[PDB]
Amino acid sequence: SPGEASTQTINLDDRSHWGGDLKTILHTNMPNVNEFMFTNKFKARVMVSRSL
Amino acid sequence: TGGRNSIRYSELAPLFDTTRVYLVDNKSTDVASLNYQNDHSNFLTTVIQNNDYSPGEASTQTINLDDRSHWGGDLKTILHTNMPNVNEFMFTNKFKARVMVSRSLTKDKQVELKYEWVEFTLPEGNYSETMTIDLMNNAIVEHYLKVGRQNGVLESDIGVKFDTRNFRLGFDPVTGLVMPGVYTNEAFHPDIILLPGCGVDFTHSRLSNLLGIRKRQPFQEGFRITYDDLEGGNIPALLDVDAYQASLKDPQKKPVIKPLTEDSKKRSYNLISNDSTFTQYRSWYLAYNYGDPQTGIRSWTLLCTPDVTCGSEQVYWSLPDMMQDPVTFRSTSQISNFPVVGAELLPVHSKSFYNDQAVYSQLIRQFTSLTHVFNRFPENQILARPPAPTITTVSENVPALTDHGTLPLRNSIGGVQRVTITDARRRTCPYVYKALGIVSPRVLSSR
16 A cells, blocks of 8 residues: 555665765746746836826 | 563563453454454454553554564464355355246238246245255246246146256156156156256356256356257157057057157147157256266266355455465455455355155145145146255354464554454455454564
């Protein structure tokens, strides 16, 4: 079971300090502008009223 | 041994050399909390027999066989079932047969006989060697009703019957007839009586074994036995008793030649020719014993003892959480593939008893009275009711105090072990009332 597996363990030998090589494959699809990367907002000051 | 013994538990102190851990189901605290949704053939047990801890909590603690040694334990077990003779699981409640299902005068003036394969099922229950047969014949009839008859089918032509007598004892080498005018109703092994255009298949039923008709080379998926197969060995016809007796008053030939044709209530005995002394009805027994041994069924089939149990099948124990996985077994979590530590025959034997009721019944239907759903054709000598054999057998369940060897086990036995009994096909077995395991670890070697 996945649960059951969560119990078992891989045991690198105890008598030695071990190390591992970590290679990874990352793939995204984030868009140009969006709310998260803060590319969808921007404050500007404009004219909002004109009266005599 | 020396420092390698120590069997330890949380603070409870050092125990030295073999001891005993117990695998039990009936443990009260466990039931309620762990194996609620499970059954006796696949449950969880707390092996920690310490009164003070929750079952959950216990599931944490562990029995530690000393680390410095490879340990082993003796596994004795008590298995007790109660599985019935016939049932859906062991495939003893189903069996396909091909019967007549329609009879109508086709469009011109010729006729039509259409046949079909139908699966009949028995009411689950534990039966006799015989009453089982009967249940089958009945199940054939029960169908003839819902369909057969109400479509031009006359009992005078029901296609399959499971009887039990040697339909050719009275037979006379010259007259070509069963002289005594009655097929001597003594029991001699289950048989199968077919008719033209039909037969039976056991491809998916152990009932075959109940009958005692085994395939001469079993590992062949498929078991169909049809008319055309039962060659040579058609039930000879009964001689006309009356015609013969009534004669002898006046070249000058006698009433012999007359082979009866039908019986009271005029049931056709379907004779091949208005000539031939042989009826169209064909018997397996007859075939096997009397027709060409090198060509007949005697060739590809084998005649043998009944056995109600339908076949001694075995079961497999598995204690995944407490014992090292035997040689080639892969370790997993798929219940239907756990490692196996012990095999044993499923606790069922066949007791035999002497039948007095053998003849008692021949002296009650000779003195007319009601009928059973079993003898719906009393006056037929063929669709009659197979004679009860003396010595019936009955599937009987029995406790099996078995004992598997001594197995290698892990040195860190979990607070909660999982027990699992499986069958040949690998699935729990509903018919298990009690499983009990006793393990006695003891040092085997050193690390």
